[PDB]
Every structure is written in C-alpha cells, then in structure tokens.
Amino acid sequence: INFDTSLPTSHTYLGADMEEFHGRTLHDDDSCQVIPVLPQVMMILIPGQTLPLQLFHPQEVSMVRNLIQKDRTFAVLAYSNVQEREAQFGTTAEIYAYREEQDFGIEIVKVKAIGRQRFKVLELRTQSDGIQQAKVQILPECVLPSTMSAVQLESLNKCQIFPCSYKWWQKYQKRKFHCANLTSWPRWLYSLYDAETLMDRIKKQLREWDENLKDDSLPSNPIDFSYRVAACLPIDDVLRIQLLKIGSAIQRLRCELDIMNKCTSLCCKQCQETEITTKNEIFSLSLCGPMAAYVNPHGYVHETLTVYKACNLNLIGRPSTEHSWFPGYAWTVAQCKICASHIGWKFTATKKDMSPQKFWGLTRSALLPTIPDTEDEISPD
C-alpha cells in the first residue's frame, strides 16, 4: 500500500495544467432556471462529484466557449430511458477547470466540472441549432434539527454539548437522547435517525476500505458527507435516481448504510447471475473513495470502482500504459466469462516495488448490486 491516493483525483492523464475557476454560482431553492444540457453525457451526476469531459463535436465546443464567459454552469440529466432521452431529475455541474487544444486540426476541449445542486425537470426544449435547453426547478435541501429539539426540557438544554470510543457512544446516547423517555419511542430508535451516529457507522465501514483517518479526509457537514458517500457507492442507474430524489440528508445516510449492509455481492448487469466481486474486496485507491468518474480518450465517462480481486473475467488484448487513469499501472480490457460484456480493466504495476502489484477497475454502468440468499431489490428511507 504505497501508490498515492492523490494521483487520480488530479486526473494527470488529461495533460498540461488547466485554467481554473473558483467563483461559486449557486441559485436560490425552488427557483426556475433554464440551463443547457450536454448531449453525449449519459452519466448520473451527484453533487460534489468530480466529472472530467473531453469534447470533440463543434457544437459542444461552442457551448463550452459560450459558458466560460457566462455562469460556467450546465445541466446533467439523469436519463431513465437513454434511448428516448427521458429524464425527470438531474444535477447541475459547474466547470472548475478548462483547457482548449487544437491538436490534429480538430477543436479538442478538456473540462473538469463539479456537481452542485439537484433539480427536477419541468420542460425540455430542443433549439434549431441542435443543442438542447432545459427549464428546471431547483430541489431544496431539507435540513432538519436534532429530533430532541421538540421534546428537550429547558433544564437539560445545557447538558447537550459533549467533550474507549464505544464507551463514549454509550454515554452520548444516554445523554443526548435522555428526553426520549418523554416520547412513545426509546433512545436506540432515535440513534438510527441521528446524523452523527449514522456518519460514524459509515466511517466504520469506510475505514475497512481505506486507512485514511476521518479527521481531515471526511467532511463534518452531514449534507456534504452524505453526497460524498453516495458518489462512491457502486449502484445501478435506477437506485441512483431513487437516492437522488431524497431531500433530507438523514434519509440519504440511512439509505446508504442499508445498501452497504444489504448488497454484499456485485454481479454482471447484463448476466444478473454472474458474480464478479464482493464488498470485502472493495478498497479506496483515490481520495474521493473507491469509485470515481474518469474520462477516456473518446469522451466516454466511466464511474470506475477499484477492487482487490475479481472472478469470471477474461482479458482481451495486452497491457498498455496509454492514457492510464492510475499512473504507474497498465490496463487490459476485461470481459464477462458468460455474456462477453465489457466489465472493466485489469491494472498491473509497471515496477516491482509498487504495491499492490495488481488490481481491478470495474465500470459502474456494467455492474449490478445483489443481495445474497433469495429476495428482490428494495432501498429503505
């Protein structure tokens, strides 16, 4: 374990340094905004998630040039049916880095954008020039105070601030949720709906994947924390859409913890029966988490997840280090043993001193989370 988790977050494969922007454009909640949509973006973006893009078509480059001077914000639709271009929800994206290159006589533009706000689609219009616009309504972030705020006795208000971690959590539950005896429910029930307890349980699951401490790497704000956790969870498009619909951070965290405990297997999306890997093999190779969005030479985005071992996969071609997302590793195309559908790539270290010597990178669009034994798919809260 000596690669460097900060290498992929920078997206070094894109080349020379880009012109960065730092001004944050954030619209009011429930406000109606008309924002353009990128055509070849089939990814479902999450707020706070980094998204790299390489555009080739002159229309895309022209739209980017027009946005660089304006608010630098575009929309990313959550295509439920990609064939008919149907989208009920989506996420805004703000360009934070850009660089134009006129290599080989064609206008190439490299852009790094970040998620910002969720939204509900009101109307979709397509202009005469091919590019499409969207009349959208900003979805509000429903922030809720502590469940005890409405029952808390005035005399015990001063005992709400707090200075063996297991012993500390027991004391925390007995003190913060003391007034729970005044309601129809006990303390342990409210503990399931407390942001801090949920964040700590998620932290315990995250430490299992990476040895980076939560003092700096993880944000303290439950809203930003929930969005960061969701952004690196390997789920199918339908479950991602459902999770995005959630307005409260508490429900988002509850759903995330439930998914992390339920879906222990990860099978092929096309096969549905071919098991590829388990959550035991998942580990974080990047600062964002185990899964992150990466762009390829042809502008296709892959929400790739890094795992230790993978099975039922055949390798196509020979290892290459060209446009590699993980510097110092060579990729080899990986296909499913049964359906022959592309699942990801096998990364092999170029040098012997590197550790781990080999790992797997699987694309989210080709995976399916599976619950063991026999049951259907459901996501609580």
Added chain:
Amino acid sequence: MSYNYVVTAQKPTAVNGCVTGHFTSAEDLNLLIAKNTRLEIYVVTAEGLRPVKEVGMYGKIAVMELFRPKGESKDLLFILTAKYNACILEYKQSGESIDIITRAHGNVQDRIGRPSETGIIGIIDPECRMIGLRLYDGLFKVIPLDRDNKELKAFNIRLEELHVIDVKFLYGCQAPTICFVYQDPQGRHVKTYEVSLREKEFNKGPWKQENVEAEASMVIAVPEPFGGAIIIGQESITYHNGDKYLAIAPPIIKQSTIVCHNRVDPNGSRYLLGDMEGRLFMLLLEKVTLKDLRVELLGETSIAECLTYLDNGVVFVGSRLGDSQLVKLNVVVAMETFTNLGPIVDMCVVDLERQGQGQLVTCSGAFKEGSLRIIRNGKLHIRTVPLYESPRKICYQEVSQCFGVLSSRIEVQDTSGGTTALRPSASTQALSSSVSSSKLFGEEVEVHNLLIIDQHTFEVLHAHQFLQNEYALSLVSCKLGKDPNTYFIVGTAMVYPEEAEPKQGRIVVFQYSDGKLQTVAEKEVKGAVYSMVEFNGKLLASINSTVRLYEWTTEKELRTECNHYNNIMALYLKTKGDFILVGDLMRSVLLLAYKPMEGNFEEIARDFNPNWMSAVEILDDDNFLGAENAFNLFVCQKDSAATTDEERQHLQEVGLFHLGEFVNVFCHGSLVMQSTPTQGSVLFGTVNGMIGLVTSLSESWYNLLLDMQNRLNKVIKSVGKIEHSFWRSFHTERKTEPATGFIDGDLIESFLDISRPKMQEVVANTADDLIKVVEELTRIH
C-alpha cells in the same frame, strides 16, 4: 377540503418555568408559574398560595423573567415565546377588574441563523439596562430597556465562542458585564465580556479566561456583597471573582448532574440545587470575603425542572415529569401536591362504571414519578395511581376486568455480577410475579415488565419480567380467529449495545384467567416489532421495513399469511375496515389495503415530506390526522374518485395547524354521556399534560366558524399583542404557512366569556343565537 375542529379539554399541567418577585404590588409577594401556553399568578401568603389571575398567551413561553427598572413602582414581566415573540407586561387592577397590559411587543426572529443547540437563553441586567438573548450560535442579540423602544428593536453582536453552554449577567459591576461558559477544542472555559451600548460591541472582560471542568454545565450569578459567579458541573462546584478562586468536589453530587437552581437569601449566602434524580441539595457560602463553600443534601422531592424559595422555609418544586410540589424545610416535608399529567406517552378510553359516559386512563410521569391517571367529567375529576417506574403502553380487558401496561424500571449493575433496584416500584411489589424462558460497574440498565392491574382497586395483580436485553414496544388486547378467549399480545425487540439496528424480536401471546398469567404462544421474528393492531380477527404487526399479518391457528399458534416490504420503516400502524395506514418517523406516510380475495396487500397512496412525525390516527376512510415537528398537526386526504392513477396514488396535505404541543397518543371515543354538528371524535394526549379533542365538521359550519374566528381576533385582547393568525400558523425552521382546514376551539369557546357589548360587535353581520351554538359545541368535552 378537510374541515376539522380542535379544542383543549385539559390545560397543560407541566411546569416549564417559575419566578418570584413583586408583580401585582410592591408589598405583595408574587409567584409566577408558566405552563407552556398558560401563565398563573399567585400571592404568597402565610397559609399557602392565593390565586389571582390565570392568562392564556398566543405563544409557547420559552423565557419568563421579572425585573424592576429604576423609577418604577413595581416589577414588570418579560416573556419570550418559542416563535421569538417578545413582550413586556405590567399588572393593572382597577377595583375588581384585573387585566394584564402590554407595555412593549415585537418579534426578534432573524431571517438567517442557526438556532442554538443549548436552546434559547434570556437574561436581564441587574440594574435593568438591557435584555440579552442568545438565539443563534455566534450572535448575541441585545434589546435596550428604554421607554421609547415600544417596538423592541434589537441589535446583534458577533461572538467568536460558538458553542456557548451558559451565560449570565454580573452583579456589582459598573459596566454591563456578561460571564459565560463555552467549549473549544482545548476544553471548556469561562470567559467575560463588557457590553457597550454606545459602541454596540464588546470590550475586554474584568477577568482572564480560566480553564474549568470538562462537564461544566450551569452558571449562577452571585449578588452583592460577594459578586462574581459560580460554575456547577457533574463533579465540581467552583467560584470565580477575578483574583478569588474556590473549588470543592463534594462526592454527594456525583450520583447525578445538577440541572436547576434558585436563590434563597438575596445576599447570596444560601442557594438551592436540584438534580435529575429528584434530590434537593442546599449550597451554603461562608463569609466580606468568601471563606469556603458547603453542600448538604436536604432530601428527595419530585424531579424538578425549576425551583424557587418563597419564605419561612416554604419552597416550590416546579416539576415537568411528576406532580408539582410545595414543601417545608427544617434545615423536607411535602405540604401540597398539584396533579401533573405530563408526560402522557399512551392512553385508552374505557367505560368503567356508567357504560355510557367515557373515562380516560393515561400513562403519565417517568422514573420514580411514573403513574397512571384516571380522568372523567363531573370540572374534570382526576384519580392518581403512583407506580414509581416509567409506564410505556396500556390496554383494557373487559372479559377479565383488568388493564395491561408495559413498564420499565431502572436497576444498577452490582459488583457481584447481578442487578439491584434503586427504590420499590410496581414490578417489585407485585402480588404475583414471573419471568420469561431465557435464551442467549455502576451502569444503569432498563428492566422491562408487563403489569396486569385490577380496574377497581388498581393493585398490581401480576408482573411479568421479560428476557435480558429485551425492549417491549407494542401491546394489544383482543380475540383472534374463532377463539373466544381474550389475550394480551406483546411485541418486543432484542437490544444490544453493539447492534444499532435490531436483528431479533418476539411476539408473545398471554392469557389472564383466574388470577394467573400464562405464556400461551411465542413467535420469533428477525426484527423489531414496532407496532401491532387487530385487523378483522387477525393480528397485523410491523417488523422493521416489513408489515406481516398473522392468523391464529386451531393449534393455538400464529401463522404468517402475507408480507409487504415497504420502502420506509413501519413505526406507526392504524386500521379501519380493510384499510391500513403505515407511517415512519420522518412523516413518510403510506396507505395499504388488504385484499381479502387475493390474500395480499396493495399500495394505495403515499406522501413523503421529511419532518419528525410524533403520532398518527385515522379520522375516516378518506381523512388521516398526524402530528409532526414544531408542535404541528397535519391532515392528508386521498381521492377515490380521481380520474388519473397519478392523482389517486398521491395524498394531499389538506390540513395544516400549529398546536403548540407535542402529541404522543391518539384514541377514539369521548368523555361526555352519549342533530349533532360534530361527526367523529378523536382524543389526544401530549407531553405537557394537555389533553385535547379533534372532530370533523361540515362545509357550512366550517365557513361560519372561520368568519367568526377573524371577527373575534379583532376584539379579543391578545396577551402580549400577538396576532392569533400568526400563533396558529404551521411553522418549521424553513417554511411557515398559515392554518388551513382547522378551527381553533379555544378561540370559539372564548366568545362566551367576553362582555355583552363586545358580543354584539362580533355578531354585527343575534348575540344569544351564537351563545346557543357555542354551548352545543362545549357539550362535546
């Protein structure tokens, strides 16, 4: 579209604040007691208390303090509501007419800000120069105490200390100095500041920042000639004055944290302290300079929320958990008790004697104050039954003429590897007791029990002790299948400090017959049994995010029939005919319908707005009432005659209202002896000991009563000049909407109490015709 009527049948009895002073006159000694939305004034006499006036405000009393500006004949009162409505009041008596006047009123709510974790704090300067408020972390609001400031304009001052635990004003300080205890990454510290009005800012405090106990919770302002301040925590009691520092660590208080206090001697020689366990201690300061401190335990009273000294050794114990008390000290003897129904956690309507006039049985109190209350009509008649342990649920059995109650006592871990109870409770003094068939230090452990009590004597007939690390959650009493025996059904969950979500649970069926409780049937489930209901001879139960229906077999067992895996956690469960309503803690509501023909469930409609739900109930086959966060009540409606499938599968929030109370239980029935204008009857219990009744109305009656509401608001004097429309508005930290589909019963009933000239002004579209209408309405509770 809904049209409902909400009235208060019992005023809130829970005491959240109390103060002493000279409010009515400089000679009379006044004691003011706040009970959420009500305020009561009493004159401290040699015999006891003399009631003078009881007023009803349009706000939840959050801060209540008395003070005397220089030049004033008597003390003035200051009240700040939960909705940030501040008002200064004066007492005026002109012979026999007693009215409370409003000197100044206004709202201090900022458009932006994060409400503090330690709640709203309100303090007044000793010389009465300004009012200091802490509403948002990092912002200290100052309200100048001027005669011209009738609008109560205020200004904010920036604070670098964000997590401030407590703050008070200092005595004997030439400048208005504030002393506060806060926390930072380095620990908890005490710090002082000088509030400057000319600069509208802060100046260097009189003393430096001293490090204190990591559990410092309370601050006490010491008056002259001592001055300075006292800091109370879990294990230490310190005194700071600048150069003078005293610190004592009495082991007598380590058992529990001190939460409330009051001054006994105006000079600052004696103070009273109250802990979480109901123990009352006395702090004594020895003397020009402070020689030493001393703490002596006086005795045990009700678990206090606030305290106050009256005179001649008489003390008032304002309790929120148990009955309020008036005691005598021989430095403790109980002199008088005042019934407190709060907190009500569950209740039931029973026809005990008359079989026509309903009676209510409620689970009130908590810990040693735990008790049962029996309420009926004659003024209401109340009967108290102490338990000395926390009651949870309740049920009635007519066949066996007995009640079943879930209870929980606290025991402490023994050194020998066992447990010991603190005091005698109902489960330990049971005439007959038992234990379940077992499977699988100083810390406190909750021991759950099921008590069977007689309906006449109220004796603890039986007490069944559940398994270790098990929590009883639900309780029903009904006949199932073709069995004529009536059983007590209980739902449990295995709680472990290592498992956040429970993965085990039981559903047990017991029979009470011939004075013996026997374990009839037992069914294991892989989750928590949050709630259960009788559904047309079958037993409906909720297990985590699933809803399961059980059938009672001929072999006297339970067999699963169908399952429904819900998108949310099934906490609340209600039924009517073949309709079932499921609800979670974050207002996510779902409707199901058991298809008799198909033998399964069907999702009918849903509405997922995230807000802390507290309780739910079915009004009729189309309307559904629920109580949620910020003391609000909402009503949803389905549309069976909707043209689109999208319209029928959605619930419309057709009713919104701000009750000002935290509801915990709903029941069907009424307390009055059964062309009525009211259809339906739903009783509800809260945390502050308030009981209310909600019913449905017709369109015409709703329109007339709403017009009457607007006309009444124009004539009725509001306590603190607060608009009734704003007080009854659905309020949350993000959105504040006005009331719709509701009629305030208290305001409608208040029409009979006003003078006749004002009655004529209201009905100026006939005063006696409206009196008859209001009388018919009052006859429902």
Added chain:
Amino acid sequence: GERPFHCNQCGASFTQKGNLLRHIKLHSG
C-alpha cells in the same frame, strides 16, 4: 499482427474490423 482496429468505448485492440464491429454491439446490450 499489430491490432489497429480499436473500440472507442473501452479500448479493446482488434486485428480485424469484423471483430471490432461485433464487440461494439456488446456495449449496446
């Protein structure tokens, strides 16, 4: 040989055009 026909989506190297045209249909599903 040298595999000059490549997949724009994943980067699969192929010696013939027929091999590539079939592989691109696998991504369509």
